Amino acid sequence: YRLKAYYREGEKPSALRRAGKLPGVMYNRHLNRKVYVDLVEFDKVFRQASIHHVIVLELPDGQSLPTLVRQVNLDKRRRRPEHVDFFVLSDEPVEMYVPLRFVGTPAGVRAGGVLQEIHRDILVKVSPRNIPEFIEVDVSGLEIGDSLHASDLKLPPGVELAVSPEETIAAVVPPEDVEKLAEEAAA
Amino acid sequence: MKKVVAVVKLQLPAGKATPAPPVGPALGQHGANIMEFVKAFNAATANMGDAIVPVEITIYADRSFTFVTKTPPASYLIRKAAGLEKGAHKPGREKVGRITWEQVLEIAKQKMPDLNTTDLEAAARMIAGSARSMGVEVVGAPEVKDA
Amino acid sequence: RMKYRKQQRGRLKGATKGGDYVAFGDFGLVALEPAWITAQQIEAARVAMVRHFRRGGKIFIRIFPDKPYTKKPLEVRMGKGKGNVEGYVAVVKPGRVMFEVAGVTEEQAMEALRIAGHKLPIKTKIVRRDAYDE
RNA sequence: GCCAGGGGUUGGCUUAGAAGCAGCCAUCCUUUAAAGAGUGCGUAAUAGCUCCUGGUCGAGUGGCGCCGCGCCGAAAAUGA
Numbered sequence: 011y012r013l014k015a016y017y018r019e020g021e022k023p024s025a026l027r028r029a030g031k032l033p034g035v036m037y038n039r040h041l042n043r044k045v046y047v048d049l050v051e052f053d054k055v056f057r058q059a060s061i062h063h064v065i066v067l068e069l070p071d072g073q074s075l076p077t078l079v080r081q082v083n084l085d086k087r088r089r090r091p092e093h094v095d096f097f098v099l100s101d102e103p104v105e106m107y108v109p110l111r112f113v114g115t116p117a118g119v120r121a122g123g124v125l126q127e128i129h130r131d132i133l134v135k136v137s138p139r140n141i142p143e144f145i146e147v148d149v150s151g152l153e154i155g156d157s158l159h160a161s162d163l164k165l166p167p168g169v170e171l172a173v174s175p176e177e178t179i180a181a182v183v184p185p186e187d188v189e190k191l192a193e194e195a196a197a
Numbered sequence: 198m199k200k201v202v203a204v205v206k207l208q209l210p211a212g213k214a215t216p217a218p219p220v221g222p223a224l225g226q227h228g229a230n231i232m233e234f235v236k237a238f239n240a241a242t243a244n245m246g247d248a249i250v251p252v253e254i255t256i257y258a259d260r261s262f263t264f265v266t267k268t269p270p271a272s273y274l275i276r277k278a279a280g281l282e283k284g285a286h287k288p289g290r291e292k293v294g295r296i297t298w299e300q301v302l303e304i305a306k307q308k309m310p311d312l313n314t315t316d317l318e319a320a321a322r323m324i325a326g327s328a329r330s331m332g333v334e335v336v337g338a339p340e341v342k343d344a
Numbered sequence: 345r346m347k348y349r350k351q352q353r354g355r356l357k358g359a360t361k362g363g364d365y366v367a368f369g370d371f372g373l374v375a376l377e378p379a380w381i382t383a384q385q386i387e388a389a390r391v392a393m394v395r396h397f398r399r400g401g402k403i404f405i406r407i408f409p410d411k412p413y414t415k416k417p418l419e420v421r422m423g424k425g426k427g428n429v430e431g432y433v434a435v436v437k438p439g440r441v442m443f444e445v446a447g448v449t450e451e452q453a454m455e456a457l458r459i460a461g462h463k464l465p466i467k468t469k470i471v472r473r474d475a476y477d478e
Numbered sequence: 479g480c481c482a483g484g485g486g487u488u489g490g491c492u493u494a495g496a497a498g499c500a501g502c503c504a505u506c507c508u509u510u511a512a513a514g515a516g517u518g519c520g521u522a523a524u525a526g527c528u529c530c531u532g533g534u535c536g537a538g539u540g541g542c543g544c545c546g547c548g549c550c551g552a553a554a555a556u557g558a
Contacts, residue, residue: 057474059475060477061477086361086439087438089471107477124400126446183402185402185447189399191394191395195391205497205525270488271486271489271490285490286491286502287504289504313485313508313509314507314509320486320507320508324486327506330504330515331489331490332503333490
């Protein structure tokens with residue numbers, strides 16, 4: 011996902027918003043600079059990609075940079091972002107979140123339940139070369155009440171995690187229904 | 198060279214039969230000459246075994262019927278190896294019997310001469326597909342083969 | 345519950361921290377107006393939603409009423425309200441997520457929350473998930 | 479908008495009855511350029527009309543989110 015990057019300086023923060031240009035910042039160990047990216051362009055780019063896929067940023071210098079959305083500040087009250095962060099990479103190992111896919115239906119939902127996915131992404135310490143678009147998780151034999159922890163995932167070559175190997179990826183939860191409602195509001 | 202009136206669908210065994218419902222509120226309030234119309238029912242189930250034959254009845258324009266004996270529903274071929282007399286109440290979580298994808302291959306050659314399906318490789322998934330939504334699964338070996 | 349006794353009124357100042365991001369489930373329901381949601385209000389929603397999709401998906405009540413709503417017994421001025429008539433409330437400020445659903449397709453988790461909002465005083469706005477995480 | 483055609487299957491289960499159509503559980507294939515084991519009404523249960531096709535037609539259409547302004551919701555006692 012590419013996106014045209016623009017340079018901001020003294021320009022007042024809000025006024026940029028009145029241009030549909032959401033203000034922002036790129037930076038890292040060897041750099042710091044103010045920026046501002048068009049909201050519509052950003053949106054289309056972000057939705058699909060988010061904080062997993064890497065987004066290159068083209069400056070008025072003919073520069074292509076391998077940035078990542080470290081964080082993004084949103085305006086509570088009508089979900090809409092005020093400020094974005096971009097982390098410039100190089101080729102040294104780096105931490106970031108990677109997406110998740112859960113194939114097949116567990117012995118839970120297939121019988122009668124609901125898939126309670128706790129994460130949609132896991133934290134990994136990996137180099138800009140390796141940036142897996144998804145991590146397979148064979149959630150087939152997950153009976154109602156069981157769960158798959160961080161200690162059993164499809165870790166591709168040279169991709170060691172970053173969170174506790176005891177942290178839980180997700181869980182198979184009980185379906186709530188009306189048959190409960192007689193006992194719930196009862197005792 | 199013949200006249201008809203209306204189509205009606207009935208379910209009943211082959212050979213043993215009486216005017217009892219739901220065949221009652223059927224050929225009863227419309228009249229039926231079961232004096233000779235049944236001498237063609239005992240010659241049509243003479244050497245034919247028992248089952249649940251839905252003879253596709255189509256009331257003529259002369260107050261008769263087109264007794265064309267068809268092949269039993271795909272709910273009788275599955276409980277033919279399970280011995281049961283019904284089906285599973287929730288096809289999904291519970292499993293009454295676990296037949297084979299082999300018994301579906303030679304009980305379906307009894308369901309093609311009437312059904313509108315050509316070869317049998319398609320008639321293998323019809324009897325194994327109508328079994329899916331009734332509470333029973335199978336197991337195979339050959340399959341696609343391919344490369 | 346434990347806490348301790350009756351608390352003061354307060355003021356529904358702005359929207360500041362009153363606001364979130366969908367954390368659990370596929371869709372979401374959030375508040376556009378500041379207000380004092382009650383217990384039985386939330387309950388009025390809890391039920392309706394489940395009565396919609398019996399044997400359906402799992403519901404998450406993200407907000408929680410720990411503010412003692414006080415009241416007075418039909419007279420006048422001696423002492424402060426024995427209150428607790430309505431019970432305990434939640435300070436809900438615009439942008440705040442209130443009801444998360446899952447295990448239900450659009451048409452399900454859409455006609456589920458909307459109904460909720462109608463057992464709800466303020467105005468609401470169902471939500472997808474875009475991608476805005478953290 | 480119109481003309482015409484409009485399978486095993488009557489899905490399995492429940493039920494006095496549940497025939498695409500009270501309730502429950504679900505993910506077959508075949509004639510085919512097309513017809514959902516099923517959108518609604520209907521019958522005691524059906525059939526049936528309709529929300530499938532080719533042609534005629536002849537160029538756009540359907541749905542969704544947001545804004546500015548307005549519309550219903552809006553009934554009182556001396557005359558407006």
